[PDB]
Amino acid sequence: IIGGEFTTIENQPWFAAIYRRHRGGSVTYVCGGSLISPCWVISATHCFIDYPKKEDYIVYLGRSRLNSNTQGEMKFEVENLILHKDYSADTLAHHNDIALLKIRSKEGRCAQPSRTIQTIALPSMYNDPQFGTSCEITGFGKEQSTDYLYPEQLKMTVVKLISHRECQQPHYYGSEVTTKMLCAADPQWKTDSCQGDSGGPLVCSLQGRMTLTGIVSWGRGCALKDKPGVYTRVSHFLPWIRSHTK
Numbered sequence: 001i002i003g004g005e006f007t008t009i010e011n012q013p014w015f016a017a018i019y020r021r022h023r024g025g026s027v028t029y030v031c032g033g034s035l036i037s038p039c040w041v042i043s044a045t046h047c048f049i050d051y052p053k054k055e056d057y058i059v060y061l062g063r064s065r066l067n068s069n070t071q072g073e074m075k076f077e078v079e080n081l082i083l084h085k086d087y088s089a090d091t092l093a094h095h096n097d098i099a100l101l102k103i104r105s106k107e108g109r110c111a112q113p114s115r116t117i118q119t120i121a122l123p124s125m126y127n128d129p130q131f132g133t134s135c136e137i138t139g140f141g142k143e144q145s146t147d148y149l150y151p152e153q154l155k156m157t158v159v160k161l162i163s164h165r166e167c168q169q170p171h172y173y174g175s176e177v178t179t180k181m182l183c184a185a186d187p188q189w190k191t192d193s194c195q196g197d198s199g200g201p202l203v204c205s206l207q208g209r210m211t212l213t214g215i216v217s218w219g220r221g222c223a224l225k226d227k228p229g230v231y232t233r234v235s236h237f238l239p240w241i242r243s244h245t246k
């Protein structure tokens with residue numbers, strides 16, 4: 001996350017931290033995700049397309065730090081890694097960039113709510129907030145596009161949903177942005193998601209409830225003028241989600 005502030009998992013208790021196991025025994029961070037039910041984490045297909053075996057991944061919930069332990073955290077294995085059949089990537093854009101991870105503990109349990117772990121609501125079919133609405137994004141991604149390290153503490157920031165009309169303009173992304181996506185950015189372009197924030201939540205208040213409106217997908221750089229963050233539009237994937245969550 002570029003700009004914004006350091007936070008803790010209690011302020012974003014649906015946030016899932018996804019890592020990959022490495023030969024040589026190293027484990028490194030992959031992407032964010034969101035807990036949409038006790039057994040299911042939603043994320044972005046692009047995080048996993050290169051290495052699609054579930055056995056390689058580990059999901060933490062309740063985790064406020066990247067490479068050290070948080071009290072109350074819970075470790076899970078990936079019982080089912082579901083990537084979208086129609087995923088494809090442009091030079092810039094990714095399409096149908098959505099994924100599901102079915103989680104279970106080695107002891108076989110799914111997630112139990114606590115001070116640091118909660119599910120997040122899906123939006124109702126085709127129901128998104130209006131443009132100009134303020135939403136929050138969260139992640140362990142880079143603090144500056146040029147950095148080589150990820151921050152050790154979880155960050156969040158606030159961005160504003162931008163109209164399709166406006167995200168169409170050729171000084172933005174043009175044809176590359178579609179109706180399966182949402183755009184969001186800072187009015188002054190000073191804060192944004194960045195590399196490593198992919199798969200994480202874009203959270204908006206909807207019917208007096210924190211709702212998972214977007215999934216961090218792609219952008220031109222991070223926090224660059226006229227290049228807002230692009231997000232998978234969750235409200236247009238409910239059939240995919242309901243079907244594959246059975």
Ligand SMILES: NCc1ccc(Br)cc1
Pocket residue numbers: 192193194195196197198216217218219220221222223228229230
């Ligand atoms: N795919 C990494 C990335 C995602 C969002 C923005 Br904005 C920038 C980069």
